[PDB]
Write an enzyme that holds these catalytic residues in place. Structure first.
Site, PDB file in Angstrom:
ATOM      1  N   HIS B  41       0.811  -1.222   0.000  1.00 25.91           N
ATOM      2  CA  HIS B  41       0.000   0.000   0.000  1.00 25.91           C
ATOM      3  C   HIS B  41       0.858   1.292   0.000  1.00 25.91           C
ATOM      4  CE1 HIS B  41      -0.104  -0.755   4.444  1.00 25.91           C
ATOM      5  NE2 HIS B  41       0.060   0.566   4.513  1.00 25.91           N
ATOM      6  N   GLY B 143       2.787   5.803  10.077  1.00 22.86           N
ATOM      7  CA  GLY B 143       4.184   5.741   9.690  1.00 22.86           C
ATOM      8  C   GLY B 143       4.882   4.497  10.213  1.00 22.86           C
ATOM      9  N   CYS B 145       4.023   1.326   9.555  1.00 23.15           N
ATOM     10  CA  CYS B 145       3.895   0.281   8.548  1.00 23.15           C
ATOM     11  C   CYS B 145       5.229  -0.080   7.987  1.00 23.15           C
ATOM     12  CB  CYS B 145       2.933   0.697   7.444  1.00 23.15           C
ATOM     13  SG  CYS B 145       1.204   0.719   7.957  1.00 23.15           S
TER      14      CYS B 145
HETATM   15  C1  I70 Z   1       0.272   2.268   7.673  1.00 23.56           C
HETATM   16  O1  I70 Z   1      -0.145   2.427   6.323  1.00 23.56           O
HETATM   17  C2  I70 Z   1       1.392   3.248   7.999  1.00 23.56           C
HETATM   18  N1  I70 Z   1       1.887   3.975   7.004  1.00 23.56           N
HETATM   19  O2  I70 Z   1       1.805   3.316   9.158  1.00 23.56           O
HETATM   20  C3  I70 Z   1      -0.975   2.370   8.575  1.00 23.56           C
HETATM   21  C4  I70 Z   1      -0.714   2.095  10.057  1.00 23.56           C
HETATM   22  C5  I70 Z   1      -1.930   2.357  10.965  1.00 23.56           C
HETATM   23  C6  I70 Z   1      -2.383   3.827  11.090  1.00 23.56           C
HETATM   24  C7  I70 Z   1      -2.812   3.975  12.559  1.00 23.56           C
HETATM   25  N2  I70 Z   1      -2.079   2.907  13.220  1.00 23.56           N
HETATM   26  C8  I70 Z   1      -1.667   1.936  12.399  1.00 23.56           C
HETATM   27  O3  I70 Z   1      -1.174   0.867  12.749  1.00 23.56           O
HETATM   28  N3  I70 Z   1      -1.997   1.460   8.074  1.00 23.56           N
HETATM   29  C9  I70 Z   1      -3.053   1.892   7.384  1.00 23.56           C
HETATM   30  O4  I70 Z   1      -3.313   3.083   7.232  1.00 23.56           O
HETATM   31  C10 I70 Z   1      -3.962   0.799   6.808  1.00 23.56           C
HETATM   32  C11 I70 Z   1      -3.963   0.780   5.270  1.00 23.56           C
HETATM   33  C12 I70 Z   1      -5.315   1.273   4.798  1.00 23.56           C
HETATM   34  C13 I70 Z   1      -6.177   1.499   6.034  1.00 23.56           C
HETATM   35  N4  I70 Z   1      -5.345   1.096   7.177  1.00 23.56           N
HETATM   36  C14 I70 Z   1      -5.716   1.018   8.466  1.00 23.56           C
HETATM   37  O5  I70 Z   1      -4.981   0.540   9.309  1.00 23.56           O
HETATM   38  C15 I70 Z   1      -7.101   1.531   8.882  1.00 23.56           C
HETATM   39  N5  I70 Z   1      -7.758   0.426   9.556  1.00 23.56           N
HETATM   40  C16 I70 Z   1      -8.790  -0.254   9.009  1.00 23.56           C
HETATM   41  O6  I70 Z   1      -9.276   0.034   7.914  1.00 23.56           O
HETATM   42  N6  I70 Z   1      -9.237  -1.256   9.800  1.00 23.56           N
HETATM   43  C17 I70 Z   1     -10.299  -2.225   9.445  1.00 23.56           C
HETATM   44  C18 I70 Z   1     -11.639  -1.499   9.419  1.00 23.56           C
HETATM   45  C19 I70 Z   1      -9.968  -2.790   8.069  1.00 23.56           C
HETATM   46  C20 I70 Z   1     -10.339  -3.348  10.471  1.00 23.56           C
HETATM   47  C21 I70 Z   1      -7.067   2.816   9.762  1.00 23.56           C
HETATM   48  C22 I70 Z   1      -8.504   3.213  10.103  1.00 23.56           C
HETATM   49  C23 I70 Z   1      -6.405   3.967   9.002  1.00 23.56           C
HETATM   50  C24 I70 Z   1      -6.299   2.573  11.066  1.00 23.56           C
HETATM   51  C25 I70 Z   1      -4.867  -0.130   4.466  1.00 23.56           C
HETATM   52  C26 I70 Z   1      -4.417  -0.447   3.039  1.00 23.56           C
HETATM   53  C27 I70 Z   1      -5.594  -1.293   5.144  1.00 23.56           C
END
Ligand code: I70
Ligand code: I70
Lengths: 305, 305
Positions: B41, B143, B145
């Site tokens: 992603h 951040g 991830c």
């Molecule tokens: C990651 O992309 C990063 N760059 O750190 C991030 C890490 C997250 C942000 C808050 N704490 C973390 O651990 N991950 C994401 O943004 C992923 C990414 C997009 C949505 N996402 C999420 O984690 C969301 N959660 C979510 O959709 N949860 C469900 C409903 C599926 C159980 C969210 C709301 C931003 C925390 C994808 C591709 C899954």
């Protein structure tokens, strides 16, 4: 986003660990530049440790008597001296993996990571707090002596602790990197009593701010209190007094959450008098005091090193 | 001697962390040899993440579009491919700090250390367990991830996890190093439900052996039970079934303490039915399931790496 007892990355400290052997005693050492630091009881036999004369035993030791090893590689000892309860073994080679470092004496209530080592090899890393009674609740076995406690500030390793001994009920005692013990302890196998421990109040308040940030808000009441009234309640529950300096240190968390320190103090006052009724806060059933206000902000607002 | 939630020394893993940037998205990467591994992603904009077509977005990306940085030093990308939910960016330089490593898929109930990183820089290390519902109770912000979970076996780093997303109530989900998610999750910002979690029974029993080793023995009763009778009681309390394979894994602790697994099972059966009456075990007021039998022995009998 979650809240865990997080330790500092141990890498910069791992590259400093050596094995120090003298006679039949082996413990860990810290190699920074061309000097190795280790507990002075490395020159003791099990019988000397009951009542030792370190100054005397060190006279009967020459440089070659210290077998210092960094992995497989033996370091040649070209000098030795004693600074308080610590030995400084000068070696013919400077440690190329030495990071930017400082030697600090932490205050009680402050936290640090311990890199537990055996035979100069790191077995694990955990976060500790210097208890108000000058002890630490660590995890150390025989051979862990010489393992160090530290903090990291971007690139600077601030070494604050070196392991020396174990106290009754799994409590541990040691020195700063200048060989000065934290608390009223001496490096001797004789009866020594640790003072009464207290709960680090400012750290419990910081942990309550970490809980609000994370969504756990149930314990928040609609009251405020005075610094004096709160300290009257806390005294009964073996909690250290909260000073105006503690109130100012808590400022960032207070401003971030919108909860004034004295309103959080009223909520804590209620948790001490009424209990938690079987409920948890940040997954914990007991109030936690091993997270400083800085550990809270660094974690909940991603400070990297 | 003390018992703490100990993490593995992060050094070998720290030397592998890189910053991966594509367009306006920056996350962490793992650089092993001439390949960088990061969540797929990284090629998404905030709007794509709602329902993304990774295979499509990757067509519109060439090598030069990936800004990979190891500290200050930019690594030139000479190839890219997608393996499940992970990106493999081939770089023109092999990582000289690459340790001996394996890519393993851990089973639920097993533990590992997470090195939380931001912008390719490590902020901290903590110990986690893969929950029976395939999630982890971590501490991750935006951040984080690309941060990885691992285990160490003397010199071998066994990478088992890569962070991808956050789930409701501070629970986290991710993949193995082959891009396969742990559990029924997909990398999309859409409603996805995590299954009911259970308590890792074999880990609670191992933690009870750690407590006896450390001197906390109050909860030990004078009874035994059968594997069947215990599993009937545990089922009610949302505890996973204990198998004969779990009994054999607990052998070393049982032999070391002299307490047969079925006698410890009777003591646990009593703690579930009667409660702890406000008492603690190893300083804890709740039963702990995030310490495997191996974490117990490694800690209480100093395994170094
Ligand atoms: C990651 O992309 C990063 N760059 O750190 C991030 C890490 C997250 C942000 C808050 N704490 C973390 O651990 N991950 C994401 O943004 C992923 C990414 C997009 C949505 N996402 C999420 O984690 C969301 N959660 C979510 O959709 N949860 C469900 C409903 C599926 C159980 C969210 C709301 C931003 C925390 C994808 C591709 C899954
Ligand atoms: C250390 O020398 C090493 N090589 O690891 C060792 C570490 C101890 C052993 C068990 N867990 C640890 O953390 N430290 C010692 O052996 C020191 C050393 C000699 C006695 N000693 C102790 O820690 C003892 N404790 C003790 O005497 N405690 C009092 C009564 C003073 C409060 C003991 C009983 C061996 C754990 C000296 C020079 C203090």
């Amino acid at each position: 986003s979650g809240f865990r007892k997080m330790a500092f990355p141990s890498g910069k400290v791992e590259g400093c660990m050596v094995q120090v052997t003298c006679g039949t005693t082996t413990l860990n050492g810290l190699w920074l530049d061309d000097v190795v630091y280790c507990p002075r009881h490395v020159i003791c036999t099990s019988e000397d440790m009951l009542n030792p004369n370190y100054e005397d035993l060190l006279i009967r030791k020459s440089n070659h008597n210290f077998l210092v090893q960094a992995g497989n590689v033996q370091l040649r000892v070209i000098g030795h001296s004693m600074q308080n309860c610590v030995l400084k073994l000068k070696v013919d080679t400077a440690n190329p993996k030495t990071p930017k470092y400082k030697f600090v004496r932490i205050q009680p209530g402050q936290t640090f990571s311990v890199l537990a080592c055996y035979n100069g090899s790191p077995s694990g890393v955990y976060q500790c707090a210097m208890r108000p009674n000058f002890t630490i609740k660590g995890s150390f076995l025989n051979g862990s002596c010489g393992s160090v406690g530290f903090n990291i500030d971007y690139d600077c390793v601030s070494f604050c602790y070196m392991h020396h001994m174990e106290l009754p009920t799994g409590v541990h005692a040691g020195t700063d990197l200048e060989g000065n013990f934290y608390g009223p302890f001496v490096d001797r196998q004789t009866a020594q009593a640790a003072g009464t421990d207290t709960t680090i109040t400012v750290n419990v308040l910081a942990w309550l701010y970490a809980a609000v940030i994370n969504g756990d808000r149930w314990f928040l009441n609609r009251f405020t209190t005075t610094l004096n009234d709160f300290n009257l309640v806390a005294m009964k529950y073996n909690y250290e007094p909260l000073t105006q300096d503690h109130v100012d240190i808590l400022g960032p968390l207070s401003a971030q959450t919108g909860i004034a320190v004295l309103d959080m103090c009223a909520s804590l006052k209620e948790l001490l008098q009424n209990g938690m009724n079987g409920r948890t806060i940040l997954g914990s059933a007991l109030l936690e005091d091993e997270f400083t206000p800085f550990d809270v902000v660094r974690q909940c607002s991603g400070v990297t090193f």
